[PDB]
């Protein structure tokens, strides 16, 4: 069982930075090492084969090198579309394939405040006995944010969940949804529904709210 030890597991770098990813084989695999780029939700794409050959169609800012059992992927001038998880792979023989653990590459950029929107539950959902209230934070950076639900100014705990998009391949921003879930009976117990957003780009917390009905 040939091991590929990949480091680092993750890194954050600015546009234009030079990025170095390393992969150590536990024994010799000659130059039978490939590097792949994997976008979230998509199949890996081949970047480099035979340790250092640029795959046709891959931009020349990607390059690879071999030194004994040490293999290195270099991105010479990091671009916003380069956010991905990168994997090394040794392919010495069909039955022996192993992969490195991967390196998640994030893009660093300037602060950008989110635009906030709140969405009340629809009448069709309420008829089924559930009230989903959604707060959207659109196109912001960095990912870290605080989203708090207030129901008649009572701070909510344990009944909301967050989802975040991957970095935009052009502006490197994120979007975020926070969804508050209540029963219909609980939703009808209260009037004012508000989501309060704190983020590095907002001079003071932004509240969006509506009144039930």
């Amino acid at each position: 069982d040939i091991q590929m030890t990949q480091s680092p597991s993750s890194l954050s770098a600015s546009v234009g930075d030079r990025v170095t990813i390393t992969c150590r084989a536990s024994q010799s695999v000659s130059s039978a090492v490939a590097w792949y780029q994997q976008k979230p939700g998509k199949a890996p794409k081949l970047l480099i084969y035979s340790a250092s050959s640029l795959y046709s169609g891959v931009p020349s800012r990607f390059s690879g090198s071999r030194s004994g059992t040490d293999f290195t992927l270099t991105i010479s001038s990091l671009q916003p579309e380069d956010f991905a998880t990168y994997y090394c792979q040794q392919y010495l023989y069909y039955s022996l394939v192993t992969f490195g653990q991967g390196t998640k590459v994030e893009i660093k950029r300037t602060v950008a405040a989110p635009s906030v929107f709140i969405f009340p539950p629809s009448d069709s959902q309420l008829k089924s006995g559930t009230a989903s209230v959604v707060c959207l934070l659109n196109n912001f950076y960095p990912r870290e944010a605080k989203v708090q639900w207030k129901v008649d100014n009572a701070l909510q705990s344990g009944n909301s969940q967050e989802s975040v998009t991957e970095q935009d391949s052009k502006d490197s921003t994120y979007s975020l949804s926070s969804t508050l879930t209540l029963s219909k009976a609980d939703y009808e117990k209260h009037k004012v529904y508000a989501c309060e957003v704190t983020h590095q780009g907002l001079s003071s917390p932004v509240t969006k709210s509506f009144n039930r009905g």
């Binding site: 989903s132 969940q161 989802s163 975040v164 998009t165 979007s175 969804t179």
Partner: peptide, 21 residues
């Protein structure tokens, strides 16, 4: 368009939102 990763609810079902500006 932003279509968010699905979230697993305590009931074991998924949900997601897709938004557009």
């Amino acid at each position: 368009v932003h279509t968010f990763p699905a979230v697993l609810q305590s009931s074991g079902l998924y949900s997601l939102s897709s938004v557009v500006t």
